[PDB]
Each structure stands twice: as structure tokens, then as C-alpha cells.
Write a protein that binds this ligand. Structure first.
Ligand SMILES: O=S(=O)(c1cccc2cnccc12)N1CCCNCC1
Length: 290
């Protein structure tokens, strides 16, 4: 079965081996589907990222094709640029843009963002989601770990390994996918769902940005899911630490009934996002500057 899948991947990826033009691989990250290294382009001295995913180490091996469909069809300003894909031994390698500012996780766990900064992030993410949802693409793993930054504060969506497409022929998805603490209620309830689940997950990320952790983060994953499924929408630790504008925004995200939840398109017009600062406003939050 493994050799069968190797062959299948070979027919969709680029030919060759990026080790022929890259030097000095250094591991910088570990994700749900594999590791991420920086590498130096020999000819230019430029830095790229290389995501390496072991075919044998996947829960759902077929989801590896998501990397390919996204790379081919859904490139965008607030989405990480993907350059080439390769089959290297038993691994799928994706050579992509290096986002040197790192992931939003490092910021939310170590510093407190103000609302100019939170609004900047939300605006960037919602811009990406509005375009993706309009083409039927659902990300399904929105969380601070999936948001990457450039050195000058530009925000980009990454980690599309769990995404799916809906359409007239396939209006809803049914799969149990994502990261427990960020999963929408209807998804946990095993109801057919749509792009609305990304909006709930963004709400949880707003809580990350304000409080530093998602709700129920101290609980075990399976217990947290049960609590998300059963209880009223999760609450901020301290409501006084958010403006009424941000509270009103968050209230449109964390709605249990998917039909009543705001869409990305509608949220781009919300007053809270008027507070959004330029990318420069994010820069002082990064490790190399604080
Ligand atoms: O920052 S990453 O190293 C990362 C991922 C994908 C592309 C990247 C591009 N440049 C820097 C870091 C990147 N990352 C590890 C996996 C899951 N945890 C957080 C994300």
C-alpha cells in the first residue's frame, strides 16, 4: 500500500530532488503532518522553508494531496506561497516561502497584543478566508499555530493539510478534522458542516490573542471536546480587557448555530476591524524585537 501511494504521489509532484539546489537544512518546526526546515538556496543565498511529510506517519494519507491542490489553484496575498513539491524517498517535500517572523503562537504565549494588533491579524485572516470560502475551500485548522508572519508584520495563512472543498455536488463535509480546542460545535457533534467552522475557530484564536490560551486548554482533549459540544459558547477570562467593539465582534464568531454565525464576507465590514493597524504595528511583538 505504501509503494502504491509513493507511485501515485510521483505523478502529481515535480520531478527531481531539491537537495540538488538547497544547502544547510536546519529543523525549525514540527507540525501535525511532519517537520519544517529552513534551507539555503545555493545559487542565490536566499532562504526557503521545506516541509517534510513522511507518508507512513499520516493518519489520513490521502489528505497529503491537499498540499498539491492548494499549491496549484489557491495562491493569494495572505496565503503562504508554495513553490514546488517533490517525492524524496518515503517523504513528500514542499518547498515554500520562508516566513521569518515565525508563528502567531510565539507571540500570544509570551506577550499581550493590543487591539490595533488583534484587528490587524483578524483583518488579514478574514481577507484570506473570504477568498477561500468563495471558492468552496474550508481550511479546518485555524489556530495561532497556522498563522505565520513576515519580518515586517505581514500575516499569512498556512498548514492546509486538513482542508476540504464543498460545492453544489458536495455542499457539506462530515469529517472529524482539526485541533480539539479550536473545533466548532457542529463538527464535534458530527453534523454536516461548511465554511462556518473556520469562523468559530477564528473566534477561538481571538481568545488566544487576548488570554494566551484557548478555552479548556488545561482539560484533556476528549473532555474539552465534550464541553465545547455541550456548553454555551466559551467566555473570555476577563471581559474588561476587551473593548465593547471587540466583544461585539467576538460575539459574531462564537455562535453555536452555524446558520447564525457571521460569514467572512460580512465580518470584513465589522466596525472592530476599523481599528486595524498596518503590518508594522505587529513587528515589535516578535521575539527578535521584544
Ligand atoms: O513556524 S512553523 O515552523 C512553519 C510552518 C510552515 C511554514 C513555515 C514557513 N516559514 C517559517 C515557519 C513555517 N510551524 C511548525 C508546524 C506547526 N507549528 C507551528 C508552525
Amino acid at each position: 500500500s505504501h509503494e502504491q501511494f509513493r507511485a501515485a504521489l510521483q505523478l502529481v509532484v515535480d520531478p527531481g530532488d531539491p537537495r540538488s539546489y538547497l544547502d544547510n537544512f536546519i529543523k525549525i518546526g514540527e507540525g501535525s503532518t511532519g517537520i519544517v526546515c529552513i534551507a539555503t538556496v545555493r545559487s542565490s543565498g536566499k532562504l526557503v522553508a521545506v516541509k517534510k511529510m513522511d507518508l507512513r506517519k499520516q493518519q489520513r494519507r490521502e489528505l497529503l494531496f491537499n498540499e498539491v491542490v492548494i499549491m496549484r489553484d489557491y495562491q493569494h496575498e495572505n496565503v503562504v506561497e508554495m513553490y514546488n513539491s517533490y517525492l524524496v524517498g518515503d517523504e513528500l517535500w514542499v518547498v515554500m516561502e520562508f516566513l521569518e517572523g515565525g508563528a502567531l503562537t510565539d507571540i500570544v504565549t509570551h506577550t499581550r497584543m493590543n487591539e490595533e494588533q488583534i484587528a490587524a491579524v483578524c483583518l488579514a485572516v478574514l481577507q484570506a478566508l473570504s477568498v477561500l470560502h468563495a471558492q468552496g475551500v474550508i481550511h479546518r485548522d485555524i489556530k495561532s499555530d497556522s498563522i505565520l508572519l513576515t519580518h515586517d508584520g505581514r500575516v499569512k495563512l498556512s498548514d492546509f493539510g486538513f482542508c476540504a472543498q464543498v460545492s453544489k455536488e458536495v455542499p457539506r463535509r462530515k469529517s472529524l478534522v482539526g485541533t480539539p480546542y479550536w473545533m466548532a460545535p457542529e463538527l464535534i457533534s458530527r453534523l454536516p458542516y461548511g465554511p462556518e467552522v473556520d469562523i468559530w475557530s477564528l473566534g477561538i484564536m481571538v481568545i488566544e490573542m487576548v488570554d494566551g490560551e484557548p478555552p479548556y486548554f488545561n482539560e484533556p482533549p476528549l473532555k474539552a471536546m465534550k464541553m465545547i459540544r455541550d456548553n454555551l459558547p466559551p467566555r473570555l477570562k476577563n471581559l474588561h480587557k476587551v473593548s465593547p467593539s471587540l466583544k461585539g465582534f467576538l460575539d459574531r464568531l462564537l455562535v453555536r448555530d452555524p446558520a447564525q454565525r457571521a460569514t467572512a464576507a460580512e465580518l470584513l465590514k465589522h466596525p472592530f476591524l476599523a481599528k486595524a493597524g498596518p503590518p508594522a504595528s505587529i513587528v515589535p511583538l516578535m521575539r527578535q524585537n521584544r
